[PDB]
Amino acid sequence: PTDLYILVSGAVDFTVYVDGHDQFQGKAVIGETFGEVGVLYYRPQPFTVRTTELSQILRISRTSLMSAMHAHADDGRVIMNNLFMKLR
Amino acid sequence: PTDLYILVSGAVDFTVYVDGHDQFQGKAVIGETFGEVGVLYYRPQPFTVRTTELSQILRISRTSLMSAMHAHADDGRVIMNNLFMKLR
């Protein structure tokens, strides 16, 4: 992983790559972020990400996140949102 | 702060020290831990801790906790329990 990809517009279609020959599932809509695996898990992305109609995608990359790490006492809220986010 | 104090038996009475001349509130019962401020907050303890009847108190100290930190992928559950613990 290298960067966060917040959508601002445009549809996104995710399909299984190598493990899955065709079909499967993958989605993200306007405002719905992805790339939240490689926040601190430092692990590769699960799916493939192919666009359908054109989009505008912000990019707060990995080193920019880790530079934002020293601004603490509010990263606890982010990490609580991560834990309650993935457990549900 | 220096150590965690898990009760195993015995009552504990906590009263305000210096800021409060008398009364106030402070409690912990069999099994109910305290010292959970100085987990990662690295901040001094709020209350005073005076025993009432004798007790048996375990002690997993600060350096022992920080030695337990490298055993990861299950400290996330501890930190989620911290965040959902204090926010309620």
UniProtKB/Swiss-Prot annotation, chains A, B:
Superkingdom of this protein's organism: Eukaryota
Cellular compartments annotated: Membrane
Tissues in which the UniProt entry reports expression: Expressed in guard cells, and in roots.
Amino-acid positions noted as binding a nucleoside 3',5'-cyclic phosphate in the UniProt annotation, renumbered to this chain: 1-86
Role played: Highly selective inward-rectifying potassium channel. This voltage-gated channel could mediate long-term potassium influx into guard cells leading to stomatal opening. Assuming opened or closed conformations in response to the voltage difference across the membrane, the channel is activated by hyperpolarization. The channel activity is enhanced upon external acidification. Also permeable to ammonium ions. Blocked by tetraethylammonium and barium ions.
Comment on protein domains: The segment S4 is probably the voltage-sensor and is characterized by a series of positively charged amino acids. The pore-forming region H5 is enclosed by the transmembrane segments S5 and S6 in the Shaker-type (1P/6TM) and contains the GYGD signature motif which seems to be involved in potassium selectivity.
Description of how the protein assembles with itself and partners: The potassium channel is probably composed of a homo- or heterotetrameric complex of pore-forming subunits. May interact with AKT2 and KAT2. Interacts with SLAC1 and SLAH3.
Homology family: Belongs to the potassium channel family. Plant (TC 1.A.1.4) subfamily.
Stated name of the protein: Potassium channel KAT1
Native organism: Arabidopsis thaliana (Mouse-ear cress)
Upper taxonomic lineage: Eukaryota, Viridiplantae, Streptophyta, Embryophyta, Tracheophyta
